[PDB]
Design an enzyme around this catalytic site. Structure first.
Site, PDB file in Angstrom:
ATOM      1  N   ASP A 159       0.814  -1.196   0.000  1.00  0.00           N
ATOM      2  CA  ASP A 159       0.000   0.000   0.000  1.00  0.00           C
ATOM      3  C   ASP A 159       0.867   1.274   0.000  1.00  0.00           C
ATOM      4  O   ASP A 159       0.585   2.270  -0.651  1.00  0.00           O
ATOM      5  CB  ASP A 159      -0.852  -0.027   1.284  1.00  0.00           C
ATOM      6  N   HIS A 187      -4.215  -3.339   6.927  1.00  0.00           N
ATOM      7  CA  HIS A 187      -4.079  -3.615   5.495  1.00  0.00           C
ATOM      8  C   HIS A 187      -5.464  -3.962   5.002  1.00  0.00           C
ATOM      9  O   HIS A 187      -5.800  -5.134   4.977  1.00  0.00           O
ATOM     10  CB  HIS A 187      -3.216  -4.878   5.284  1.00  0.00           C
TER      11      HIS A 187
HETATM   12  N1  NAD Z   1      -0.418  -7.982   2.753  1.00  0.00           N
HETATM   13  C1  NAD Z   1      -0.487  -7.791   1.418  1.00  0.00           C
HETATM   14  O1  NAD Z   1      -0.235  -6.741   0.818  1.00  0.00           O
HETATM   15  C2  NAD Z   1      -0.934  -8.898   0.485  1.00  0.00           C
HETATM   16  C3  NAD Z   1      -0.983  -8.657  -0.885  1.00  0.00           C
HETATM   17  C4  NAD Z   1      -1.414  -9.668  -1.747  1.00  0.00           C
HETATM   18  C5  NAD Z   1      -1.717 -10.909  -1.231  1.00  0.00           C
HETATM   19  N2  NAD Z   1      -1.574 -11.164   0.094  1.00  0.00           N
HETATM   20  C6  NAD Z   1      -1.922 -12.505   0.575  1.00  0.00           C
HETATM   21  O2  NAD Z   1      -0.920 -13.478   0.266  1.00  0.00           O
HETATM   22  C7  NAD Z   1      -1.476 -14.786   0.620  1.00  0.00           C
HETATM   23  C8  NAD Z   1      -0.950 -15.804  -0.370  1.00  0.00           C
HETATM   24  O3  NAD Z   1      -1.175 -15.256  -1.670  1.00  0.00           O
HETATM   25  P1  NAD Z   1      -1.001 -15.976  -3.093  1.00  0.00           P
HETATM   26  O4  NAD Z   1      -1.314 -15.000  -4.188  1.00  0.00           O
HETATM   27  O5  NAD Z   1       0.401 -16.504  -3.216  1.00  0.00           O
HETATM   28  O6  NAD Z   1      -1.941 -17.210  -2.995  1.00  0.00           O
HETATM   29  P2  NAD Z   1      -1.789 -18.576  -3.723  1.00  0.00           P
HETATM   30  O7  NAD Z   1      -3.080 -19.255  -3.482  1.00  0.00           O
HETATM   31  O8  NAD Z   1      -1.191 -18.418  -5.124  1.00  0.00           O
HETATM   32  O9  NAD Z   1      -0.718 -19.212  -2.768  1.00  0.00           O
HETATM   33  C9  NAD Z   1      -0.936 -19.318  -1.409  1.00  0.00           C
HETATM   34  C10 NAD Z   1      -0.160 -20.507  -0.973  1.00  0.00           C
HETATM   35  O10 NAD Z   1      -0.488 -20.701   0.433  1.00  0.00           O
HETATM   36  C11 NAD Z   1      -0.135 -22.036   0.658  1.00  0.00           C
HETATM   37  N3  NAD Z   1      -0.505 -22.398   2.004  1.00  0.00           N
HETATM   38  C12 NAD Z   1      -1.757 -22.471   2.581  1.00  0.00           C
HETATM   39  N4  NAD Z   1      -1.768 -22.870   3.834  1.00  0.00           N
HETATM   40  C13 NAD Z   1      -0.411 -23.107   4.112  1.00  0.00           C
HETATM   41  C14 NAD Z   1       0.226 -23.552   5.283  1.00  0.00           C
HETATM   42  N5  NAD Z   1      -0.507 -23.893   6.358  1.00  0.00           N
HETATM   43  N6  NAD Z   1       1.586 -23.777   5.239  1.00  0.00           N
HETATM   44  C15 NAD Z   1       2.280 -23.355   4.153  1.00  0.00           C
HETATM   45  N7  NAD Z   1       1.781 -22.965   2.975  1.00  0.00           N
HETATM   46  C16 NAD Z   1       0.419 -22.918   3.014  1.00  0.00           C
HETATM   47  C17 NAD Z   1      -0.957 -22.699  -0.453  1.00  0.00           C
HETATM   48  O11 NAD Z   1      -0.739 -24.091  -0.551  1.00  0.00           O
HETATM   49  C18 NAD Z   1      -0.532 -21.825  -1.662  1.00  0.00           C
HETATM   50  O12 NAD Z   1       0.655 -22.352  -2.199  1.00  0.00           O
HETATM   51  C19 NAD Z   1      -3.005 -14.536   0.538  1.00  0.00           C
HETATM   52  O13 NAD Z   1      -3.538 -14.506   1.859  1.00  0.00           O
HETATM   53  C20 NAD Z   1      -3.176 -13.116  -0.051  1.00  0.00           C
HETATM   54  O14 NAD Z   1      -4.408 -12.434   0.246  1.00  0.00           O
HETATM   55  C21 NAD Z   1      -1.270 -10.161   0.977  1.00  0.00           C
END
Ligand code: NAD
Ligand code: NAD
Lengths: 327, 327
Positions: A159, A187
């Site tokens: 952000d 966030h």
């Molecule tokens: N704070 C921020 O600015 C921000 C920005 C974008 C995304 N995110 C967050 O990032 C997170 C992941 O995003 P993404 O795009 O890579 O999703 P994605 O679905 O492509 O990947 C997420 C991964 O999480 C893994 N995962 C789930 N539970 C797990 C656990 N217990 N142990 C280890 N790995 C595990 C899944 O198997 C998958 O590989 C989401 O919550 C998303 O909202 C945060």
């Protein structure tokens, strides 16, 4: 000369990790003189895809990659970690309502908090990326007996970088000349990007743009940016999120520029009157691995209102998890 | 700082492009003191997504990103280009047959070869990544009247890095101690990874491994490596192909290490008896923008036969292209 540090990354087969890992191993996060051992964690179903990520990391022949290990056990992944990027979080499922999301995330973050507290270095630096970042970081630290709560932070840096990108475009100036941006709060859609203390090449931001712009254009545009990316590409902004994660860790470990500060969501100690304990984004400076909230900034009525709305959102969320007996 | 160079990238909204662009803007390909202007090209149907990729690059707040422009017009993308990374190629479409594929690529690479000659810098350096890269590079240079054909190259650096990785793994030594790897020939299944001249921590590779392992295990495994990644992740090796493209440009523009060499496929000038014209991978060293083939290595019989086979394959493909009236 430098011995390797161990970097734990969860959600490592996911799209954020696919954009994250290669730049970490290339030396972008902790310095081109600092070798890294990556310890990667996935859920059991994604382990095969994780193996394929591991083969692609090998196929880059990174001289700083001193070790690479993939696992589905948090106690192995966090073993002796120096740094832990907690990207993996509960997925959305159908008819899975809010409290259902909270519960699932509560369990992941409880278990991960516990593991860190048992096997990581005691000074482990933790960044929570997976949504809802701030509340996940709260459940993790609260479940991490014996670790300093201030080593648990949540990411608002994307952000913060979006805000700087939009101010740069509006004033026609290079983004490297924007300083003192702050994103306060959660966030989420209540975050408050603050132009009152920002500077654009030495000059106060609000001498270059007007309040109408600020309130009617800049605020809603920074807030909607993630949706704009999804509308355009059909996928969420993983590469720019991975870049913000690298920056948050790099500026915390290597320090912030003189004269500047960055946004980090950290456990509040009452700075600015914000309730203790919630994980709230403040302006911060860092030096040699430690950060300090920037205090003393003057807060006007416009900012205060916004800062409080977002704090209240976080307090309600914390109320929820408590009720769920998560902390 | 240096003055900015213009880098043009095609297929910019694709998978390799999403892993490539952020590392380029970060300063990884031409150095942290060289600002870059990215000129991105996509086909018209992928312009919406390319705008979403543009937004994520803005949102990285990169200090060396001195300009960024997206277009569907090659003469716009290639304008004043200093470097051109030709990533986009003809997709596979059902029932679409070989020569069919050949024609569609033929159209792409002639128009591209033409735009580059009309509007890029005369000393523009060109890297062809899109498949079939070697023959695509032939079509483009043949259709780019006015430019030095040797400024036209194809990427075999991914095969080269995979070979280094497997050898490091086998010998249990770090990847950074592996030198003088060579991948000769086409970027195809007839590629020949040459252990004859390689060195592992100072020792020749073949004192540490046997011929049987080399021919029965090492060659097939490097050739099948792209398939292993697809079977494991369910998607091809974008991040590591993007790294090899960065390294290919980097080592050509900056220079190879002392006492070492890299693989690049360049237009043959009869080196090692390799037919003239075809874009063939050789061992090369490079200094400040120019490369030279490493000549005078001893080629034994086992190597010549393989060099020959991949040479024939390319000769035949070129035959096809000429027959199609492409060059
Ligand atoms: N704070 C921020 O600015 C921000 C920005 C974008 C995304 N995110 C967050 O990032 C997170 C992941 O995003 P993404 O795009 O890579 O999703 P994605 O679905 O492509 O990947 C997420 C991964 O999480 C893994 N995962 C789930 N539970 C797990 C656990 N217990 N142990 C280890 N790995 C595990 C899944 O198997 C998958 O590989 C989401 O919550 C998303 O909202 C945060
Ligand atoms: N040389 C090698 O080592 C190597 C390695 C990996 C992949 N490849 C090649 O990489 C190429 C691209 O790979 P990918 O994984 O990114 O595929 P992708 O489909 O995800 O992306 C390719 C992009 O090219 C674009 N494109 C198509 N025709 C174009 C044109 N005329 N101008 C501009 N853009 C155009 C598409 O719209 C798409 O956005 C493929 O040909 C693949 O065979 C070669």
């Amino acid at each position: 000369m430098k011995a390797p540090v161990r970097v734990a990354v969860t959600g490592a087969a996911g799209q954020i990790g696919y954009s994250l890992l290669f730049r970490i191993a290339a030396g972008e996060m902790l310095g081109k003189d600092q070798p890294v051992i990556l310890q990667l964690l996935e859920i059991p179903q994604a382990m095969k895809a994780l193996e394929g990520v591991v083969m692609e990391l090998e196929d880059c022949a990174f001289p700083l990659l001193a070790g690479l290990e993939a696992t589905d056990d948090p106690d192995v992944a966090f073993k002796d970690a120096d740094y832990a990027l907690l990207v993996g979080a509960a997925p959305r499922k159908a008819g899975m309502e809010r409290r259902d999301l909270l519960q699932v995330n509560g369990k992941i973050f409880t278990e991960q908090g516990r593991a860190l507290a048992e096997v990581a270095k005691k000074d482990v630096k933790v960044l929570v990326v997976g949504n809802p970042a701030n509340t996940n970081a709260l459940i993790a630290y609260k479940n991490a007996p014996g670790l300093n709560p201030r080593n648990f932070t949540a990411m608002t840096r994307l952000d913060h970088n979006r805000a700087k990108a939009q101010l740069a475009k509006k004033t026609g100036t290079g983004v490297d000349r924007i300083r003192r941006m702050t994103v306060w709060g959660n966030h989420s859609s209540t975050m408050f990007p603050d132009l009152f203390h920002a500077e654009v090449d030495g000059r106060p931001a609000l001498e270059l743009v007007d309040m109408e712009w600020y309130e009617k254009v800049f605020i809603p545009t920074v807030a909607q940016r993630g949706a704009a990316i999804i509308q355009a590409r059909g996928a969420s902004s993983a590469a720019s999120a991975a870049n913000a994660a690298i920056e948050h860790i790099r500026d915390w470990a290597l320090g912030t520029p003189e004269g500047d500060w960055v946004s980090m969501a950290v456990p509040s100690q009452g700075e600015y009157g914000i309730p203790e304990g919630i994980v709230y984004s403040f302006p911060v400076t860092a030096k040699d691995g430690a950060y300090r909230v920037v205090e003393g900034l003057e807060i006007n009525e416009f900012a205060r209102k916004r800062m409080e709305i977002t704090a209240q959102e976080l307090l309600d969320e914390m109320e929820q998890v408590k009720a769920l007996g998560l902390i």
